[PDB]
Design a binder for this molecule. Structure first.
Ligand SMILES: O=C(NCc1c(F)cc(F)cc1F)c1cn2c(c(O)c1=O)C(=O)N1[C@H]3CC[C@H](C3)O[C@@H]1C2
Ligand SMILES: [Cl-]
Ligand SMILES: [Mg+2]
Ligand SMILES: [Mg+2]
Ligand SMILES: [Zn+2]
Ligand SMILES: [Zn+2]
Ligand SMILES: [Zn+2]
Lengths: 270, 252, 48, 69, 47
DNA sequence: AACTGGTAGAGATTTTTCTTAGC
DNA sequence: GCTAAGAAAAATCTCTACCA
DNA sequence: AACTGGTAGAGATTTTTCTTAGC
DNA sequence: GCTAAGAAAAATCTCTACCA
């Protein structure tokens, strides 16, 4: 048997910190017991679970960051769904200039959600006042995790490579920054639709507005209520709006929630 | 198909419809409808901007307006020289597609710096809407003046209220929705024109019904899975693919 | 109701019917690029 | 009296085996591994943990969650 | 952890001679160690 | 003309093994 | 007596941080 | 209890298009 | 006249560094 082997394996791990394969082969205990002996140790457990998340890419979300180049401060904002860039040179990295940059951006484009890191200029009362007046939701990343703002750091890299490409055609750094913004937005193609970034932001915002107006006109003349049967218990839920009926399943709306129910579990009522 | 093409030709002969309406109504592709409009003798701007400078409280406000929609970009300059005007023009050309600029005969607008920026960014500059937009913007600035401390903050808050809060016109839209609709329509037209030229570099030899001789070289308009639309003798007609041979044409 | 209210109601209802049949196809001519679970590539153009 | 005690022990057994997890996480400027904490919420990409009566948000790439057998 | 459950299940079987599914359900240990606790007892037999 | 990324652990998915209900 | 469902336990596969 | 890596280019492999030899 | 081999040209897939 292996019960005395389990006691010996606990003493051996307390001294040497074996892994589970070493203990399961030396003391001939099963692998579940050796995995438990390692999992109940605090000096071990130094390793994460090896995955990546995905960031928010809604059609009115912007990310923002500050970078440095030749002793200057550049501030970059990116539209996430298209890749569209605005960038400027600041005299200092204070909160007043960041609030002025954000107010000009909100005066030019529709901004509803802003994502930043925890820098001192972004966690500021001036930026908070501008977000209150212009009705922007500001979210911050997990501290010391630059992967939360992945799009704007990727665009920091692209902006610096273009600036080294066209550096000898300008005198100052501010002219070179605006020339790089023009080259990125209108002279580079490839991506989702074979577009540039300017064509893609025009397509995304225009398609958003057109599709809301179309389904307003569609939903104002509807009929055909639907009673459907779902759940773990075969119950009956209330009045649902039929949206689309397909060969195989139907699409219903219940409580502003969209559901796809097969045709056997529903009945349409005029 | 051919019934829809003949109905679209009769309807354009009466009323001279546009190609988007004909493509939506008679259920034909868009390249065929564009060809129907292009064969008419009686049927044959989204990127022009106007700039101006004005004064307020001893400060210089520079205003650019998009003419087809009424869209506004404004700024507060430290002086009225040509270097700051050239920097404002370079920022505007970096954010929007600008091809034609209309100004007055001011000093800072007629300068070597503005000339160099227009050369690098490929803009056509012409010297002679902005005054009406300046008056409307200044009424908003005096309306929301006590909500801000400085003048640059009040200028940008008035630009936001003008662009996204005031609605009017035909359908009841703001200026930002109108500029995005205008530029999207122009983008659709240029992409379709690229497809039209790429298709029309071909040539078609077709074999008519109850004849064993191939006919003349007809130009290809549309190539489908089972149908082919060709132009021949100032006439459009539909031939199936089993009686057609498509060859490249080098007739530049 | 008077005569103008009746003629406006009748022609508006007729327009709503025929334009409904055209508008559904108009909303299904858009293209969607979506992302599934724990794969970092944008999948191809589904129909909205 | 006895039957209600049996049903209460069964329901408390299920509730005790639902969400008694331990979390070892990695945070700070110098990212060191810190001690156990209690899992509150687990979304895709990040977790919310309670440590020493302090709430923290950690990404799932910098944490390890230990269950019970 | 269930190693303290292993020690308590050994004491409980030394008193009352439980079966292995009972010890596995009561002390929350896997089934292999519970069958081993039954197997090392000379009076009992896993069945 | 003759050089070069790798290691080990955390979960997820698939395969093998073991007990027992049913004909 | 023999089969097979179902669950436990083991084996294989993909992906991550860190090493000046 | 409500958060999260991404972008763009260099080769390699597979698919579509175009001309011409042969029956 | 029709087919098909063969090569050119375009499209798709995998993998890397850099962003404080
Ligand atoms: O390490 C950085 N980038 C490189 C990088 C990346 F971009 C993306 C990756 F997946 C991996 C990477 F290694 C980086 C670090 N910090 C900040 C950045 O913006 C930043 O980009 C920042 O602003 N702060 C402020 C908030 C608190 C203080 C000042 O420290 C942080 C430090
Ligand atoms: Cl941070
Ligand atoms: Mg930063
Ligand atoms: Mg950064
Ligand atoms: Zn250990
Ligand atoms: Zn005409
Ligand atoms: Zn016994």
């Amino acid at each position: 048997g292996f019960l005395d082997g389990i006691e010996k394996a606990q003493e051996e791990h307390e001294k040497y910190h074996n892994n589970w394969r070493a203990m399961a082969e030396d003391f001939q205990i099963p692998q579940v017991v050796a995995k438990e002996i390692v999992a109940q140790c605090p000096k071990c457990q130094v390793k994460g679970e090896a995955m990546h998340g995905q960031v928010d890419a809604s059609p009115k979300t912007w990310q923002m960051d500050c970078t440095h180049l030749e002793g200057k401060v550049i501030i970059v904002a990116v539209h996430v769904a298209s890749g569209y860039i605005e960038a400027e040179v600041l005299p200092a990295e204070t909160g007043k200039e960041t609030a002025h940059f954000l107010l000009k951006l909100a005066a030019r484009w529709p901004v509803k959600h802003l994502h930043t890191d925890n820098g001192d200029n972004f966690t500021s009362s001036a930026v908070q006042a501008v977000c209150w007046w212009a009705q922007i939701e500001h979210t911050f990343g997990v501290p010391y995790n630059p992967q939360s703002q992945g799009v704007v750091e990727s665009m920091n890299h692209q902006l610096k490579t273009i600036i080294t490409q066209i550096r000898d055609q300008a005198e100052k750094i501010e002219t070179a920054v605006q020339m790089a913004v023009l080259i990125h937005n209108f002279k580079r193609k490839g991506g989702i639709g074979g577009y540039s970034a300017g064509e893609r932001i025009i397509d995304i915002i225009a398609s958003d507005l057109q599709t809301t107006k179309l389904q307003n006109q569609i939903s104002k003349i509807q009929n055909f209520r639907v009673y459907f049967r779902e759940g773990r218990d075969q119950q009956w839920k209330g009045p649902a709006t039929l949206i689309w009926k397909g060969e195989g399943a139907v699409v219903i709306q219940d409580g502003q929630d969209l559901k796809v129910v097969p045709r056997r579990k529903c009945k349409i009522i005029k």
